[PDB]
Every structure is written in structure tokens, then in C-alpha cells.
Amino acid sequence: NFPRQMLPFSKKTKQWRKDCLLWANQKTFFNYSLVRKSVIHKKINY
């Protein structure tokens, strides 16, 4: 659950900038994009 981006700039506090990054290192296993190949497919090519 990525925190809400629809906030006034005073409500984009210091903990809110950590919540977007604690989301990032949890969903950094994710690499799916609909115009890219897999990580294991490119690793076989390299």
C-alpha cells in the first residue's frame, strides 16, 4: 500500500517520505513491465 500522494505539501512530512521508501524495499522483488522481458531472460542473454 503506497501512501497517498494527493496531499498538501505540509502533509508530505518526514515520515511520509520514509513510507514511500519502506514501500520501495519491500516491493523491489517486482520487475514486471509489459514491454520488458524477465530478469532471468536477459541474464541468459548476457
Partner: protein
């Protein structure tokens, strides 16, 4: 202290899991001891059947 998962009560009040002592790090291992396991290129599944 979680009373929904911990169901055995202790004779001295509260759940019996509260009386469990755990020392998680004895010294510095020079590498991460406890971590979690994932697979490279394993996005978790979501699939609709409609």
C-alpha cells in the same frame, strides 16, 4: 502479548508467550544471520477467472 494468537494463559496473568525470553543476536556475526528468502524474478501471482 498478542492475545488472539497466544491462547494458553499463564498462572501469573496474561498469555504464556509473554513469559518467553528470546536473545536474538549474540555478538556480531560479520554477516546477516536472520533474513528472509525470496526467488529472483518471482513476482507474486494474481490471476482472474471471470
Amino acid at each position: 502479548d498478542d492475545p488472539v494468537r497466544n491462547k494458553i494463559l499463564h498462572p501469573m496473568g496474561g498469555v504464556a508467550f509473554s513469559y518467553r525470553y528470546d536473545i536474538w543476536y549474540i555478538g556480531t556475526m560479520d554477516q546477516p544471520n536472520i533474513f528472509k528468502c525470496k526467488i529472483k524474478g518471482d513476482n507474486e501471482y494474481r490471476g482472474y477467472q471471470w
